[PDB]
Write a protein that binds this ligand. Structure first.
Ligand SMILES: Nc1nc2c(ncn2[C@@H]2O[C@H](COP(=O)(O)OP(=O)(O)O)[C@@H](O)[C@H]2O)c(=O)[nH]1
Ligand SMILES: [Mg+2]
Ligand SMILES: [Mg+2]
Lengths: 13, 392
């Protein structure tokens, strides 16, 4: 998921 | 100029020891002699002495950073004006020290901050110390020189450093800085010991994988993802992980990694990633737990620490705290209440004090010696600490 340059986030599938 | 590629091994060092023993003069001497001999930028006393303020873990510290090279290695070096700056830097880990240069004036011998910096060095995990016996231009005898050397070795051994094996350079930071070839040679000797005695430190990427968990969410029919910044190491798709702290330790497998909405085969140290886990439910994992290489980290509730309490000016408490103080301990991504045991005969801790504290948390968290933490209380940061010894 969910970030894009540097803040917490994600995904995986 | 190839040095712009930064391919040489990198070592973080610094000058420690009692006020006025010559730490800043030695720092200027090291940059100047190494610039003349091998090439680099020389730094003057005034530039290093006028240390800018820098914020650590919510704490203001005055720190000067310099860099210098030897033919085989690159050094980043820290030097600070006051003893309080060394206390704060060492406890917070704001300045990394792969090795320390303990400066001892031959004229005064070991002094109270000499002992305190060796003691803190041991508690915070400074792994190696080399000694620069300074102001030898003021001591023409040998009975006092061999005596101070002997006292320094015993002092280092008193705090578990190998005093007998410690390189001790007898020099004059001032005379080398003034360009005297005989004294400049003692600076080259010191730099040679930086090269030979301080081993190349282990890079965060080569350490066992660790990720402190922040957010947790499910991807329908694919499993649970945990987000965080990879603290150290690498996680690869297909590798097993342990989920450590707060609750009983669980096992899982990394089945995916994503960063900036791009699916990757791995997550690396310093990267803000999401990690997809096999067979873990959303409610079985939480913030503050860590993902780690199996068997490399354990959960603990009790530990010994070195803590620095913020002064009023640093935005900390205005009044001391006492035994009975049950504040929140901030570890990586969460906070936990703990009970504190102060040293024998200590009833209060004043703002600005640093002390050894034995803490017992209400629940376990993944920890090892050297882990930093903050102390917070309704609703500000009152302290900063480092785990000195895990107790169980
Ligand atoms: N005679 C002599 N004086 C020195 C030497 N190194 C430092 N000093 C002097 O000692 C004083 C304090 O030195 P400084 O580098 O500021 O110490 P610091 O507080 O440890 O950084 C200054 O007046 C320096 O010029 C040395 O090798 N010989
Ligand atoms: Mg200084
Ligand atoms: Mg003495």
């Amino acid at each position: 998921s969910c970030n894009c340059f540097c803040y917490p986030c994600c995904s995986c599938x | 100029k190839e040095k712009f590629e930064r391919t040489k091994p990198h070592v973080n060092v610094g000058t420690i020891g009692h006020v006025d023993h010559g730490k800043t003069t030695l720092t200027a001497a090291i940059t100047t002699v190494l610039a003349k001999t091998y090439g680099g930028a020389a730094r003057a006393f005034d530039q290093i002495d006028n240390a800018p303020e820098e914020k650590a873990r919510g704490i203001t510290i005055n720190t000067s950073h310099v860099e210098y090279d030897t033919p085989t290695r690159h050094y980043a070096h820290v030097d600070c004006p006051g003893h309080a700056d060394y206390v704060k830097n060492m406890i917070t880990g704001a300045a990394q020290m792969d090795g320390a240069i303990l400066v001892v004036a031959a004229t005064d011998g070991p002094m109270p901050q000499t002992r305190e910096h060796i003691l803190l060095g041991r508690q915070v995990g400074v792994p190696y110390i080399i000694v620069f016996l300074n102001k030898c231009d003021m001591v023409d005898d040998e009975e006092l020189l061999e005596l101070v050397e002997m006292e320094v070795r015993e002092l280092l051994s008193q705090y578990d450093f190998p005093g007998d094996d410690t390189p001790i350079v007898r020099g004059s930071a001032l005379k080398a800085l003034e360009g005297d070839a005989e004294w400049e040679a003692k600076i080259l000797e010191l730099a040679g010991f930086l090269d030979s005695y301080i081993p190349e430190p282990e890079r965060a990427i080569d350490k066992p994988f660790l990720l402190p968990i922040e957010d947790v969410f499910s991807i329908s029919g694919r499993g649970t993802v945990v987000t965080g910044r990879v603290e150290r190491g690498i996680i690869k798709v297909g590798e097993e992980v342990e989920i450590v702290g707060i609750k009983e330790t669980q096992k899982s497998t990394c089945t995916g990694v994503e960063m900036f909405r791009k699916l990757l085969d791995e997550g690396r140290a310093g990267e803000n990633v999401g990690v997809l886990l096999r067979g873990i439910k959303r409610e079985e994992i939480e913030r503050g737990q860590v993902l780690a290489k199996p068997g490399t980290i354990k959960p603990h509730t009790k530990f010994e620490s070195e803590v620095y309490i913020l002064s009023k000016d640093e935005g900390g408490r205005h009044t001391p705290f006492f035994k009975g103080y049950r504040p929140q301990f901030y570890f990586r991504t969460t906070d936990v209440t703990g009970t504190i045991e102060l040293p024998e005969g200590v009833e209060m801790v004043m703002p600005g004090d640093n002390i050894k504290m034995v803490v017992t948390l209400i629940h376990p968290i993944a920890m090892d010696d050297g882990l930093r933490f903050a102390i917070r209380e309704g609703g500000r940061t009152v302290g900063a600490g480092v785990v000195a010894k895990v107790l169980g």
